[PDB]
Every structure is written in structure tokens, then in C-alpha cells.
Ligand SMILES: Nc1nc2c(ncn2[C@@H]2O[C@H](COP(=O)(O)OP(=O)(O)OP(=O)(O)O)[C@@H](O)[C@H]2O)c(=O)[nH]1
């Protein structure tokens with residue numbers, strides 16, 4: 001009965017979703033045509049002839065990145081109009097994905113979201129993938145989250161942001177789109193998870209010994225994190241943490257809901273067999289201030305909640321003793337209104353490896369998703385990005401050109417300034 | 429003028445190739461400890 005709809009929006013949303021559904025089909029046994037040769041109803045339905053279709057709704061305004069999926073090997077996997085396309089892109093413009101042409105794709109995407117939710121008995125989360133700092137993953141992502149809240153009350157809407165890296169961006173309007181995105185990923189999102197591309201670049205170099213990773217290797221690390229996040233939801237476990245558990249043990253206030261994730265048996269095939277990847281070893285590497293998948297050192301903040309997702313042949317006494325060890329560690333600082341901050345979960349099914357991927361077979365896993373008063377430097381870093389640009393009205397004549405009110409930039413700035421004041425006062 | 433051949437593969441088709449499926453049929457067979465014989469008597473029956 002348990003079931004999650006994934007909604008992959010944008011170029012980065014689709015390309016991450018290609019890695020996710022590639023890993024999910026290789027993990028539950030579904031071939032690229034749909035047939036396998038009931039631990040699948042969280043991500044797949046059943047047509048009746050042994051046929052399994054993924055439960056995903058792809059979105060883009062370009063047709064280029066989504067025509068790729070319907071012409072490659074995973075075309076008979078998806079239902080042929082799940083892959084929802086437009087004609088022309090918003091062109092890295094938030095107002096062009098919100099107040100203009102992405103208003104005719106929204107009524108067809110919500111058409112199929114309803115068709116993919118009424119054929120499931122009990123929905124527990126709208127997993128959502130976006131690329132905040134762009135045109136369609138920001139503009140259409142903002143309008144989609146507002147529309148999903150008004151139509152589907154409660155019904156916790158997860159999100160895996162692709163927030164721009166602090167010191168490298170590959171745009172200049174990327175300060176504008178991310179600050180304009182805080183009016184969606186703050187009051188419509190519950191599970192706003194912050195992922196920066198630079199941090200997972202550094203993970204690939206320092207751990208996997210890949211000095212030149214491509215975006216596909218970036219998405220393969222993210223897909224293993226989401227599989228371990230839904231691991232208890234699909235497989236049996238000694239301690240199951242479903243979505244309802246997640247928004248009680250990791251979110252203290254409805255506004256402070258921003259998390260950082262760090263998987264950490266992320267070991268290359270050459271270096272996997274020279275250490276035992278024991279439970280204490282993989283969680284000591286999980287709390288390192290370099291494996292965090294946003295560029296945000298937790299040592300200059302204060303942890304308020306941690307949700308660890310030990311997965312594999314992990315004995316609960318080794319979970320418990322490792323949590324005791326990291327509690328003894330002085331490098332991390334838990335906030336004074338938090339005697340216990342260590343929601344743990346155990347799933348017996350070990351993490352899988354894609355054949356020809358960049359990871360290795362590992363018996364254990366840790367997915368560490370935590371909230372801290374260190375993410376304030378992430379939003380305050382693009383605070384400096386915005387006010388350097390908006391000081392004399394850069395690139396605003398092409399946001400107000402298509403209908404954005406001159407001034408919507410300003411309360412996006414006091415929306416980021418509101419959460420800046422909130423993170424500092426929950427650490428005193 | 430000649431015409432050069434077209435060498436081109438898009439990234440989705442280079443690294444999303446249909447992969448071999450993992451080989452999974454491994455049940456966890458569990459034994460049952462045999463029930464011990466019931467050595468226990470009532471005191472009334474034991475002396476009376
Ligand atoms: N994680 C991840 N990020 C990506 C990928 N491709 C691009 N990005 C990031 O996405 C950001 C810009 O967003 P886009 O890729 O253009 O996607 P978008 O935000 O929906 O904007 P559009 O071009 O309108 O689709 C860049 O800063 C990239 O770092 C990817 O394959 N994986």
C-alpha cells in the first residue's frame with residue numbers, strides 16, 4: 001500500500017531521475033522493458049502481464065533532454081506520456097517558468113500526477129527533484145509545489161534541491177533564481193534537502209579517485225542516497241523509518257526544515273578491500289566535514305537533529321555503540337535543547353552496485369541526513385551574490401519583461417533574511 | 429571534397445546501457461531447536 005510518486009523537473013531533475021530509475025530497476029529486478037524474470041509498489045505499479053511501469057512524472061520545457069529518454073534504452077519502461085515535454089525553454093529565467101510559457105505544461109503534468117495517485121492505495125510522499133538556480137527547475141518547480149499543496153493537502157512533499165555551488169555556478173542569473181526559489185522551498189516544501197554540485201565533486205575526487213567526473217557520476221551517488229532513504233519503505237528492517245517518521249525526528253520547527261545528506265561507504269573498487277567497512281568506520285566517515293553533500297562545514301554550526309540510515313548487515317549494537325562514540329566526539333556540537341539527536345534506522349537489504357558504475361560492492365551503508373545551524377552560511381553566501389547584482393538592477397528588465405512584478409525580488413530577499421534570523425536564534 | 433564519417437554517441441546512450449541484472453535467489457534457512465522433554469512433577473504427586 002505504501003507508495004511514493006517521484007516528480008523530476010528540469011534538465012538536472014530528469015538526469016538525476018535517469019540514474020535513480022536505472023538503479024531502482026536494477027535493484028528490484030525490473031528489466032528495461034518492464035518485465036521481471038510485492039516489494040515494488042513504492043516505486044512501480046503492475047499492469048497485469050508481469051509489466052512494471054515506473055511511478056515518475058518527468059518535466060521539462062525543452063524537448064531535448066526528455067527526447068533523449070524516450071529514444072534511449074529506457075523508452076518502453078516508462079509510460080510514453082509520463083515524459084512530459086514542452087516546446088521552448090524558460091532560458092534560465094524564473095519568471096519565464098512561472099508567469100509565462102510554463103503555464104500550459106502545468107495542467108497536463110497535474111493531470112498525470114492525479115492519474116498516478118488515484119491508482120495507489122495510500123500515498124506517503126511526493127518525492128520531487130529540482131535544479132534551483134535555473135529556469136524550469138526553479139520557475140516551474142515553484143508553481144508545481146504551490147499547486148501540489150493546494151490540491152493535495154498535507155501529503156508531505158519531499159525535495160532534493162540542486163542548489164548552486166557557493167563559489168562556482170555556470171551562470172550569472174543563478175543568484176536570482178535561487179533567491180526567487182526560497183518562496184517555494186520554504187513554505188511549500190517539508191523535506192528541503194540541500195545538495196550542491198561542488199561538494200559531490202570533492203567527494204568523487206577524494207574518495208573515488210575520479211579527478212574528472214561527469215554529471216552521470218554525480219547522479220549515481222545521489223541515487224544511492226535516495227534508495228537508502230526509501231530502503232525501509234521497500235525492504236524489511238530491524239528499525240523502519242518511513243516518511244512520517246522523518247518529519248517528526250528531524251524537523252523541530254516548520255520553517256527550519258533544511259537538511260544535508262552524506263552517504264559514506266563511498267569507496268572505490270581498488271580501495272574497498274583494504275579496510276573493513278565496519279559500522280563504526282562508515283559512520284566516522286559519515287560525520288567528516290568533507291563528505292557532506294553541500295559545501296557547508298558542520299563544525300562552525302550546531303547539530304539539532306540527525307537521521308542515520310544504516311543499511312546492510314548492520315547489527316543494532318554497532319549502531320548504538322557508534323552513536324555513543326560520536327556523542328563523545330567534541331568536534332561536533334549538539335544544541336542544548338537536544339539531549340538525544342540520533343534517530344537511527346536499519347534495513348537488512350545491502351546497497352546494490354550498478355555494473356559498470358563508479359562504486360563498489362559494500363556490505364554496509366550509512367545515509368546521514370541532518371539539520372544544523374550551519375546551513376545559514378549557505379543562504380547567506382548567495383545573499384552576497386544577490387545584493388552585488390541587484391544593487392543597480394542587473395538582469396531585472398528581462399524578468400519584468402514577461403510579467404514579474406518589479407519588487408518580487410525584494411520580498412524574496414526578506415524571505416531569505418527571515419530564515420537567516422531564524423537559524424541564528426535556534427542556536428543560542 | 430571528401431565527407432568525414434560521423435563519430436558521435438550521446439552521454440545517455442554511452443553510460444545508460446542495459447546492465448546485467450543482479451543474481452538474487454538466496455533464502456535464509458532457519459532451523460528450529462527441538463522441544464525439550466517435560467521433566468516437571470507436582471509435589472502432591474511426588475510425595476503423596
Ligand atoms: N546534480 C546535477 N546537477 C546538474 C546536472 N546538470 C546540470 N546541473 C546543474 O543545474 C544547474 C542549472 O540548471 P539546469 O541544468 O540548466 O536545469 P534547470 O535549472 O531546470 O534549467 P533549464 O535549463 O531551464 O532546464 C547548473 O548549475 C548545474 O550545476 C546534472 O546532471 N546533475
Ligand SMILES: [Mg+2]
Pocket residue numbers: 011062089136
Ligand atoms: Mg533547460
